[PDB]
Amino acid sequence: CPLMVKVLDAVRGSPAINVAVHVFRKAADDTWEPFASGKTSESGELHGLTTEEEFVEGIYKVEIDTKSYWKALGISPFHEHAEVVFTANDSGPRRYTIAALLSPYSYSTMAVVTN
Template sequence: MHKSAVCVFLASVLLLCNTAPVDHHGGSDAKCPLMVKILDAVKGAPAGSVALKVSRRSANGEWTQVANGVTDPTGEVHDLITEQDFSAGVYRVEFDTKSYWKGEGRTPFHEVAEVVFEAHTEGHRHYTLALLLSPFSYTTTAVVVKTHD
């Protein structure tokens, strides 16, 4: 049983990495420097209608919301934040997983899933955050691509 769970997990991570549309956004990074992709591990399908918000940490440690969105039927959010608004700094993406699972008729363990990361430490990058959801766990990965030399 344990080996099969590990195999399912690894296959899911591979699927997330392969579904991240890195090439699709290469030419339009000014409009989409941060993209999100969410998959429902229970259904094995994209997780649509998941609300999320993006916050940036200020110098004094306080979080300021800079963007919000909802995943489309493909589990993605495009045009979340502009390149101008996505300056270097520490960001938090908070996914409203509880509402999603309640809508699916399940009682989840987590209220939210959070991803906190530092952006643009080595120049401009395009970020694709991938989230694999289940009612009692979540896994994230990121595809980070340098867009300018």
């Protein structure tokens, strides 16, 4: 599992469950091509998005559908979604964990990159 996404809800103090997550890879024509997607689990995690073979060096975007999550909770949000854009680089073995902490008018994102 070279890429995992974890989403937390700061209003409820819980994992953010059933959040839609879309991953894109930047194409040669500078457009964003769909790469992988899913919904977070009961633990707020989304595993199995890609494989070591497919997840080559490139620029990737992880779009987390925060607005739909807050609307389902009846809470008025600011953002349309939380976007995390980064370059994946082959400086030895790597695993990426993209974490997002959500509030209606704020979000924090952190990336844990390990060997």
